[PDB]
Design a protein around this ligand. Structure first.
Ligand code: ZN
Ligand code: ZN
Ligand code: ZN
Lengths: 111, 270, 104, 46, 66, 71
């Protein structure tokens, strides 16, 4: 029997980390970030928010195989702008938008 | 009116369904919210079943699966710890809920076994969890098994927290309707037709909330998807408004966890 | 399905739990799941080549009997649900065991 | 000696010895079913 | 054998509507479609759960138990 | 010699907490314990898993070595 366990797609094991950034030598100021145990849920949001930025020249993500719950995100930013700063800004904007949406939904449901 | 970002407009409210319109939001956020509400909300459900006596005509695995598919109340699921994160040996009152079901056949006619026959034996400590969800008018619940005279069914279950990703039995939402752009103004799809497109394709019920397209007008290439109509139906374990709130909270928690991991690794590497 | 064969007159196989000392040429599978009568009670999970029916037959010092048990199939596993014991036409022992498994 | 058997016709609980050929007592049926085990049986609903 | 607890496609709980469906079909005297609509099933995924379900449990219960 | 042989055990912690199985083969520190509901074999440390009675009763840790018995 070769059925993978159902908790391996959302639980971090041993020896691996949630994030892993490796520099990209193909283009300047480009990095590749690997996410473990998530796929197709926050990657699209991160890519969209990075594309919304004006100092990001490239933002894409892909899933190598549906068997493994992981995806790689590649960000290329303009000179002088660290890609990690762009990722942090996108995450903060997503957090603010989600909080505003939750507050608005609660206010609407209250009446 | 809290912040200039996403906006909501509830069209209908009910204990089982909610209809609302999302505005000033992008497609990615709406899709992520839908996916999270589908398979990210924690819920309480029966995980392990111990069968003491089974004289019925149903296999033990059959009854175990049927019991695992029975919805359970998960209003206070945030006060229950995960089984893997608990320091106990197998289970305890702070991480699991124990339910016992006993049934016997005395009457000559068939004796049905319902979800209302489940009895909670563990201490809930005031938490509003573990009660089977009953929505039938007769107040019977989900039919588990049918017994005749001389047959007995005695068994014990334990309920554990989980998410729909691990197993479909933990899903709190039944079906979520997602639709945007009732008219083909964005040209996001090509309509298959034989002689006519408008005549052959029925109009959606959301076409009345948007202005009809004007004939002889240039295609608006600067327009994007910003208005979404969503309908959420709940199984019964969690109310629809709480389902949406928990979905938003889970998405926020995932983003915050990503940010925390990034900050921690930046500190460690520097 | 398992049966007892009457070789000659007194050389008849018996259904019992074998031991590593008295019996000879035992199978590699485990024998703890067996009972005194040599048949496993229903409701016990089995897997691999575990022995479900325990039968021994005399050869003709010590070691007057050898193992003749029938192990479970190596590639199959499940839970025994019903065990049937009866007598055949001549009057010896007749044992049938059923294993139930679910295939998702 | 302590093994429990159930008749396949009248469902009568009975116990038999090794020298006692298998058969029921409340009726003439010669087919018996082994009783369910008393061990721990646990199933996962997942 | 017995009615499923939840709909296979979406996940709506349809295991508590078998008795109501039978009662509506046997004395309320209306066709299957209107009874299904009255029960609360609007999508054909849920309708097929009890519209094409065979209750073989009675046949098994017909045999004398232990 | 080894106490953990043919005795029903319950898996503690990890992703199989609360599962019931019987240990079949034990070698070194890792112990191969089968699963009842699942048709698979998982190898875990003998100390981590608790020990139960075959018929049924209270569960104990790996202190069976001191007791040199079951239950
Ligand atoms: Zn606990
Ligand atoms: Zn009888
Ligand atoms: Zn459905």
């Amino acid at each position: 029997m070769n059925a993978p366990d159902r908790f391996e797609l959302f639980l971090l094991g041993e020896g691996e980390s949630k994030l892993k950034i490796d520099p990209d030598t193909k283009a300047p100021n480009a990095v590749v970030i690997t996410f473990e145990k998530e796929d197709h849920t926050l990657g699209n949001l991160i890519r969209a928010e990075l594309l919304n930025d004006r100092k990001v020249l490239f933002a894409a993500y892909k899933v190598e195989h549906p068997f493994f719950a992981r995806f790689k995100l590649r960000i290329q930013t303009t000179e002088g702008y660290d890609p990690k700063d762009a990722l942090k800004n996108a995450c903060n904007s997503i957090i603010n938008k989600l909080g505003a949406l939750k507050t608005n939904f609660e206010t609407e449901w209250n009446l | 009116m809290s912040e200039e970002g996403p906006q909501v407009k509830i069209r209908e409210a009910s204990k089982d369904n909610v209809d609302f319109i999302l505005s000033n939001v992008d497609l990615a956020m709406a899709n992520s919210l839908r996916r999270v509400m589908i398979a990210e909300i924690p819920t309480l459900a029966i995980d392990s079943v111990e069968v003491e006596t089974n004289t019925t005509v149903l296999a033990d695995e059959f009854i175990a699966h049927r019991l695992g598919l029975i919805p359970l109340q998960s209003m206070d699921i945030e006060q229950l710890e995960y089984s893997r994160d608990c320091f106990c040996e197998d289970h305890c009152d702070k991480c699991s809920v124990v339910l016992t079901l006993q049934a016997f056949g005395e009457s000559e006619s068939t004796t049905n076994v319902y979800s209302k026959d489940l009895v909670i034996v563990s201490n809930l400590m005031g938490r509003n969890i573990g009660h089977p969800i009953i929505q039938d008018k007769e107040g019977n619940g989900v039919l588990i098994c049918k017994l005749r005279k001389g047959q007995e069914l005695k068994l014990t279950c334990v309920a554990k927290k989980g998410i729909a990703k691990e197993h479909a039995k933990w899903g709190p939402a039944a079906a979520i309707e997602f639709e945007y752009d009732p008219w083909n103004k964005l040209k996001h799809t090509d309509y298959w037709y034989e002689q006519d497109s408008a005549k052959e394709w029925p109009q959606s019920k959301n076409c009345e909330y948007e202005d009809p397209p004007n004939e002889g007008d240039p295609f608006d290439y600067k327009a994007q998807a910003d208005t979404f109509y969503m309908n959420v139906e709940s199984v019964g374990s969690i109310p629809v408004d709480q389902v949406v709130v928990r979905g938003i909270d889970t998405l926020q928690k995932k983003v915050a966890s990503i940010l925390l991991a990034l900050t921690q690794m930046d500190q460690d590497k520097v | 399905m398992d049966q007892e064969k009457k070789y000659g007159m007194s050389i008849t196989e018996t259904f019992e739990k074998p031991q590593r000392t008295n019996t000879l040429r035992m199978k590699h599978g485990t024998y703890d799941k067996l009972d005194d009568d040599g048949l496993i009670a229903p409701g016990v999970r089995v897997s691999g080549e575990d022995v479900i029916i325990g039968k021994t037959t005399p050869i003709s010092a010590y070691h007057s009997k050898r193992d003749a048990s029938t192990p479970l199939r190596s590639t199959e596993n499940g839970i025994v649900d019903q065990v049937l014991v009866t007598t055949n036409q001549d009057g010896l022992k007749f044992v049938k065991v059923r294993v139930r498994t679910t295939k998702i | 000696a302590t093994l429990k058997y159930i008749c396949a016709e009248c469902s009568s609980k009975l116990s038999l010895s090794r020298t006692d050929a298998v058969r029921c007592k409340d009726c003439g049926h010669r087919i018996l079913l082994k009783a369910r085990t008393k061990r721990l049986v646990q199933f996962e609903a997942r | 054998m017995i009615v499923p607890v939840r709909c296979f496609s979406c996940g709506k709980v349809v295991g508590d509507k078998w008795e109501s469906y039978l009662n509506l079909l046997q004395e309320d005297e209306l066709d299957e479609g209107t009874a299904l609509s009255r029960l609360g099933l609007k999508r054909y995924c849920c309708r097929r759960m009890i519209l094409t379900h065979v209750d073989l449990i009675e046949k098994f219960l017909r045999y004398n138990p232990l | 010699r080894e106490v953990a042989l043919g005795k029903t055990v319950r898996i503690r912690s990890a992703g199989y907490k609360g599962q019931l199985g019987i240990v079949k083969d034990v070698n070194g520190d890792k112990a191969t314990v089968e699963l009842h509901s699942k048709n698979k074999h998982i190898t875990i440390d003998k100390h981590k898993l608790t020990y139960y009675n075959r018929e049924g009763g209270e569960g104990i840790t790996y202190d069976e070595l001191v007791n040199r018995r079951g239950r």
